[PDB]
Write a protein that binds this ligand. Structure first.
Ligand code: PC1
Ligand code: NDP
Ligand code: SF4
Ligand code: ZN
Lengths: 154, 146, 95, 134, 114, 48, 292, 206
């Protein structure tokens, strides 16, 4: 029986990591490098990562740029409308911890004050390749998930 | 250079004696309750205070006001000063009335029972300045210190 | 020169280690304490003293422009060696 | 034991040998649970039902002014007079001089470095004492 | 002591603007509680509005009063037009800020701040 | 590196490691300085 | 106090409360509020969890960097309990299930697991222990849920005598299985607000007089179950589950005058009428009569 | 001299001459005229002269400063009138730039220049938001950059760099909340100024 549960986890994990549909908050500079990840050289679509997805068909939110206090409530609302399972990738110093505006009166010091974060991509900005490395790292995180194995043991 | 002593042997928490007679950390609430209880049960000469060398004036008057409210006037310092005659009635009895800068105006200085070099190094330096530039005449009654 | 404490936690080259009652070592439970094992203080001590035939030698740390600012070391005292203030290499005037 | 603050950790009034009142400023706060000294006594007075009539630094310094007005004249040297009156009283009672010679407590540099709790706790002052005695 | 006025030329005219602003705020609270789906009562909303006015009761400069009303009108415009979100409206109530101690002893126990 | 090998140093890692985030070998930050203020330790024996 | 746990700051996110807490059952209803209030004031929180890390994600924003630490644990593995508690100054047990599973019955969640946490905490030297029981815990209850709560409540008091035991009534709140339970459809009830229970728990950690005591957390008003369910439907704008669950809902809320309550920890009980709409607004597509 | 920026005396004279020209024509408002060593002309005016002086520079046939390049403020707390209002204008006809400066304090309105330049609309909103200077007769004066309900004017020298409040999501109330700002690492103030004078040419008489 546990053999069945192990293989269904593999199946659903494979499907979810193989069809990661992102919503990008293109907040600032870092949005440019995610555009270069979609561009032909890296072609995120070839991994199953569609270029643009609506928030309600999205699986991963990519916070790409500085999150201000004025924008923080809007970002939380979009996260709360994401169907589950949902993941958050924080990309760039600004989103990671405030970066170069960390000491500003108007900047949230890291988007993890507003939403939970699964992957932190460092850089100002991270290169398109560095972002792609972070996306592939999120895929490996999903591969490790054991939702049914843990469900069967409750 | 003595500032590094501010990082050693510091008192960081209130302490009280426990059942075994050893000092043990406690809260501010608990420690002050123990003191307040003993303070409320004594009056007059049963309560005294001694002020150390580095105490500030705000704490000196607060402690004086507190013991005065149990009718205690035994507010003492470690350093003696004769209470004979005027005592501390007149400030001029216990002050450097000439002022430190006044040394540069003097022509004779009589030092009595003191070693200013170590007691007041910057005061002694002000004497040497006068000695060097004003041809000040200095005499000492006491030990022949350098 | 890495050593462990009575708790088994490794002491860093800066002498850091959480003591017995420090809760903060809970951060290492299920993970690890990053420690660099190549203590620079011990590595420099392994270098031999260079014997030179002059009162003053210069050191730039090697590699020319890839080293450190060039400094001149006085070797008049025979009690000890001349040590470069930048890289720690030692020099001694011969006889 | 009530942990107080050192002179680098409070804004507090000191009067030098001239009678000149000066104040410190807080450079760092007291360590751990230590508190400003006049606040400890003020807090103690309230728990003992004898609340003192001042709640801030400015108010305790208003109190200091009621007792000795010169204590809040910062950097000023207030002259003191009436040496004649003091001299008259000093003669009223005759006390004999002891035969002991006048010997200062500090005779050499070794006695200079440690004279209070702060300097007695200083490792630098210990090195100085060792250096001049050896 | 001659200065350029903002709107009011004296405190009597300034006070008329204050009362108009208070009336506008008082009447808007029931709508705000409904549109923003607030969990406060209308009484709480109006009590908060009254509190905000009261803390500025001691002003005697008509220019300062004028600026306070100008800012009050802008705050009301942001609320009426739903430029604010629910978070902005609820920031007047400090719902997650545990009360700071006020008496001397409580402040003495916790830290060094006056 | 088969044609121009890197310069050898004794301290250079002989075994490369890949990204270890999410494993028991992940880096955990901590302060590398020692305690600054030393508290006074009361005497062990009783004497009030 | 060890120097690391002396309080500092102004009680905010970046402050240091001096509390180092292990919260078992932190991924549930009560746990999310407890962890939030601990992280609000800058406490170190250790979160042992049995579930997927994905299911602990909502806890991460609750503390500043490094203040929330997650660990795996198994209720039946005492070594995993020892790892989680050996650095803590307080242990909080919120473990429980409203139903039984093939792997865990009520005697496991409410007796065996709490006793093991209490015993290992005692051995590890933990000073404070806070254990959540139930107001209606009773070995003669018709509910196997409430009978186990009584047995375990006794074993904790014996194993860790200094434990603070808290006995809440039915707790209502956004994620409750009480008001939501009625909205998803003889007896007097005295339900208590989730934030009140959380504040009571937090103040028990600080209060030294709370050690060794047993508290009953109840709301300010008593209601007939019929009058309460009627009010829920009115608030939800709606025209007006296991066997053990039904027994609990029909058990009258005990009145234990001798026990200290929320007012003995400085907490004012929140009336249901103030907070009911908060919980029931999402259910939308006359205050209830109270017993004097 | 390869490293020294060359001077331009022809432009310096032209701008100086136009500076006198402007001051002769608008003596009611012009308080000072100066030309910098890198050839920028600044007219300093009484705040009453904003509309007349700007209108003259836009419309006069020897001016034709049709473009408002920028409008901003500078906070100088030591001055009685701490706010300096700066208008940078461009004349395409004469390929020239000019700067007009006036002043105000916290409580004194400045006349809005939207009637002269429609570009002024948002700039004056930004000055209101960042500095708290009120512009009279503005078609729509309100904050433009700061968050809704934000208190204070961040660009004032006495406003702290990190402000007074910071935001986070709170799970208990299920929304973003504002709280007094605490920093895990305080911003480290640096004292960088050398104690030796750099530029004798600007020494202030003692
Ligand atoms: C309905 C039935 C559909 C069956 C879907 C089977 C998909 C095949 C597959 O999993 O790919 C092999 C995958 C491919 O490996 P991969 O997903 O790790 O990717 C490796 C290759 N690169 C580096 C390029 C990404 O194998 C697995 O990952 C193991 C999981 C198997 C999941 C299926 C369980 C049955
Ligand atoms: N809510 C109420 O109305 C009242 C509750 N209580 C008590 O308060 C405590 C918490 O209440 P609540 O938070 O509502 O309960 P929840 O069911 O909401 O959360 C229960 C917690 O227990 C954990 N848990 C359950 N079974 C196991 C297990 N076998 N091994 C390990 N962990 C386990 C769950 O973790 P996972 O997510 O991994 O399942 C979850 O974190 C419980 O003890 C409950 O009985 C008392 C009175 C009233
Ligand atoms: S992290 Fe760098 S590149 Fe990205 S938005 Fe911030 S400043 Fe721009
Ligand atoms: Zn060198």
């Amino acid at each position: 029986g546990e053999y069945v549960v192990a293989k269904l986890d593999d199946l659903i994990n494979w499907a979810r990591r193989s069809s990661l549909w992102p919503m990008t908050f293109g907040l600032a500079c870092c949005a440019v490098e995610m555009m270069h990840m979609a561009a032909p050289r890296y072609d995120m679509d070839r991994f199953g990562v569609v270029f643009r997805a609506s928030p309600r068909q999205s699986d991963v939110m990519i916070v790409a740029g500085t999150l201000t206090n004025k924008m923080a409530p809007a970002l939380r609302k979009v996260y709360d409308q994401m169907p589950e399972p949902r993941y958050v990738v924080s990309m760039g110093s600004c989103a990671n911890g405030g970066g170069y505006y960390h000491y500003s009166y108007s900047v949230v010091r890291g988007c993890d004050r507003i939403v939970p974060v699964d992957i932190y991509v460092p850089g100002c900005p991270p290169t398109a390749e560095a972002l792609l490395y972070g996306i592939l790292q999120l895929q490996k995180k999903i591969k490790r998930e054991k939702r049914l194995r843990i469900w069967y043991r409750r | 250079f003595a500032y590094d002593g501010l990082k050693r042997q510091r008192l960081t928490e209130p302490m009280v004696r426990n059942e075994k007679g050893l000092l043990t950390h406690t809260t501010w609430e608990d420690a002050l309750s123990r003191v307040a209880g003993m303070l409320q049960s004594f009056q007059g000469n049963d309560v005294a205070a001694i002020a150390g060398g580095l105490v500030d004036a705000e704490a000196l008057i607060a402690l004086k006001d507190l013991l005065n409210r149990v009718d205690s006037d035994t507010l003492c310092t470690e350093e003696v000063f004769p209470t004979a005659g005027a005592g501390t009635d007149l400030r001029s009895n216990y002050l450097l009335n000439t002022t430190i800068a006044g040394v540069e105006e003097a022509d004779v200085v009589l030092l009595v029972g003191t070693n200013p070099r170590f007691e007041a190094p910057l005061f002694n330096a002000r004497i040497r300045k006068s000695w060097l530039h004003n041809d000040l005449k200095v005499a000492l009654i006491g030990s022949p210190v350098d | 020169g890495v050593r462990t404490s009575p708790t088994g936690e490794k002491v860093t080259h800066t002498g850091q280690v959480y003591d017995d009652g420090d809760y903060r070592k809970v951060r290492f439970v299920g993970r690890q304490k990053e420690v660099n094992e190549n203590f620079a203080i011990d590595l420099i001590a392994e270098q031999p003293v260079s014997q030179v035939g002059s009162r003053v030698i210069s050191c730039d740390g090697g590699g020319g422009a890839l080293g450190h600012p060039r400094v001149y070391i006085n070797l008049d005292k025979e009690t000890k060696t001349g040590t470069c203030g930048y890289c720690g290499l030692q020099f001694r005037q011969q006889h | 034991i009530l942990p107080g603050a050192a002179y680098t950790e409070k804004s507090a009034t000191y009067v030098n040998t001239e009678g000149r009142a000066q104040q410190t400023k807080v450079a760092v706060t007291p360590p751990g649970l230590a508190r400003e000294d006049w606040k400890i006594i003020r807090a103690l007075s309230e728990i003992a039902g004898m609340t003192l009539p001042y709640d801030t630094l400015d108010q305790v310094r208003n109190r200091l002014e009621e007792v000795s007005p010169n204590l809040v004249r910062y950097d000023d040297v207030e002259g003191a007079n009436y040496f004649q009156q003091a001299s008259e009283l000093s003669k009223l009672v005759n006390q004999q001089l002891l035969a002991d010679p006048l010997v200062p407590p500090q005779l050499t540099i070794k006695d200079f470095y440690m004279t209070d709790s702060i300097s007695r706790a200083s490792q630098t002052m210990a090195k100085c004492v060792k250096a001049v005695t050896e | 002591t001659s200065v350029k006025p903002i709107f009011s030329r004296d405190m009597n005219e300034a006070k008329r603007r204050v009362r108009e602003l208070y009336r506008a705020w008082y009447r808007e609270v029931p709508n705000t509680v409904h549109l923003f789906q607030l969990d406060i009562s209308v009484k709480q909303g109006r009590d908060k509005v009254r509190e905000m006015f009261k803390k500025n009761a001691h002003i005697t400069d008509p220019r300062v009063v004028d600026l306070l009303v100008i800012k009050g009108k802008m705050e009301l415009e942001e609320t009426i037009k739903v430029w604010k979100q629910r978070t902005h409206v609820m920031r007047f109530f400090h719902e997650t800020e545990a009360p700071r101690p006020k008496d001397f002893l409580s402040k003495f126990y916790v830290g060094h701040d006056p | 590196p088969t044609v121009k090998p890197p310069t050898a140093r004794k301290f250079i890692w002989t075994n490369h490691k890949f990204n270890l985030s999410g494993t028991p070998q992940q880096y955990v930050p901590y302060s590398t300085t020692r305690k600054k203020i030393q508290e006074w330790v009361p005497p062990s024996t009783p004497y009030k | 106090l060890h120097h690391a746990v002396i309080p500092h700051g102004k009680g905010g996110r970046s402050s240091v409360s001096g509390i180092v807490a292990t919260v078992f059952g932190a991924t549930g209803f009560l746990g999310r509020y407890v962890v939030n209030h601990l992280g609000r004031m800058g406490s170190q929180v250790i979160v042992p969890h049995r579930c997927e890390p994905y299911d602990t994600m909502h806890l991460r924003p609750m503390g500043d960097l490094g203040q929330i630490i997650f660990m795996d644990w198994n209720g039946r593995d005492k070594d995993s309990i020892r790892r989680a508690v050996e650095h803590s100054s307080v242990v909080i047990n919120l473990v429980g299930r409203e139903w039984e599973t093939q792997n865990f019955d009520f005697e496991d969640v409410f007796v065996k697991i709490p006793q093991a946490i209490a015993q290992v905490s005692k051995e590890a030297g933990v000073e404070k222990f806070i254990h959540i029981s139930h107001l209606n815990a009773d070995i003669k209850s018709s509910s196997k849920y409430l009978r186990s709560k009584a047995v375990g409540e006794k074993e904790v008091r014996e194993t860790f005598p200094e434990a603070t035991i808290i006995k809440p009534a039915e707790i209502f709140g956004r994620e409750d299985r009480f008001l939501n339970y009625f909205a998803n459809i003889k007896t007097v009830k005295q339900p208590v607000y989730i934030v009140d229970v959380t504040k009571g728990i937090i103040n028990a950690i600080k209060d030294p007089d709370a050690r060794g005591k047993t508290f009953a957390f109840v709301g300010p008003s008593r209601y007939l179950l019929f009058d309460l369910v009627q009010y829920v439907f009115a608030v939800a704008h709606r025209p007006f589950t296991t066997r053990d669950k039904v027994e609990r809902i029909h058990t009258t809320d005990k009145i234990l005058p001798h026990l200290p309550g929320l007012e003995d920890l400085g907490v004012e009980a929140t009336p249901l009428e103030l907070k009911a709409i908060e919980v029931l607004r999402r259910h939308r597509t006359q205050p209830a009569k109270t017993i004097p | 001299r390869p490293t020294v920026r060359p001077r331009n005396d022809v432009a310096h004279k032209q701008l100086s001459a136009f500076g006198e020209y402007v001051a002769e024509i608008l003596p009611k408002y012009v308080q000072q005229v100066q030309v910098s060593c890198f050839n920028e002309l600044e007219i300093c005016i009484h705040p009453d002269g904003v509309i007349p002086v700007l209108t003259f520079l836009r419309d006069h046939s020897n001016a034709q400063f049709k473009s408002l390049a920028d409008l901003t403020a500078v906070d100088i707390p030591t001055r009685q009138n701490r706010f300096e209002i700066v208008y940078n204008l461009l004349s395409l006809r004469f390929n020239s730039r000019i700067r007009v400066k006036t002043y105000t304090d916290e409580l004194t309105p400045i006349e809005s220049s939207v009637p002269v330049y429609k570009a002024a609309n948002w700039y004056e909103r930004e000055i209101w938001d960042m500095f708290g200077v009120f512009f009279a007769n503005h078609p729509d004066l309100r904050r433009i950059l700061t968050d809704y309900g934000f208190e204070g004017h961040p660009f004032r020298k006495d406003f702290p760099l990190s402000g007074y409040v910071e935001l986070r999501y709170d799970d208990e109330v299920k929304r973003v909340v504002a709280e007094p700002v605490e920093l895990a690492q305080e911003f480290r103030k640096f004292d960088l100024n050398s104690p030796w004078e750099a530029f004798p040419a600007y020494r202030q008489p003692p």
